[PDB]
Structure 1
């Protein structure tokens, strides 16, 4: 009269939830790439923005032997303040990412053991 069949359905339900959780992890990685990808496009713009500073006045002198060049900075590059903070952000994801993989590994081992014990009850 034991509800072993009910447990078989419940054990299967947990396995399905674990799979969806794993799918979220892969989807999260794709979203992270988009953020990093945007930075790459931004860096290209920074090189072009510096060029705009170089553009100042062409032929602005036809009665003098001099050229006015004013390459005033344009793109504010982050060397330590924003760059250092970004590294901290990436490191936090790494620690959380490692913990998630560890729990998933333990869940998989425990999930298989629960199904294994269930089979012995009604093998």
Structure 2
């Protein structure tokens, strides 16, 4: 009964979610913190970086490109 509806919504749906992308990421934060919990997450949020650049220099610097 809505052979066209879905067809037209499929193409619109794509763009019809550009807002939810930020709201979904912000909704999880404002929500999780909505509780009266007393935990620390910042800590591990710093070290996770040290393991990020240690592997990025080994790869990028190792994998060289020119003419292959």
Does the TM-score normalized on the shorter chain lie above 0.5?
A: no
- Which protein has the bigger helix share? 1
| Larger relative contact order (Cα-Cα within 8 Å, sequence gap ≥ 6) | 1
Q: TM-score, normalised to structure 2's length? A: 0.43
Structure 1 length normalisation: TM-score?
Answer: 0.28
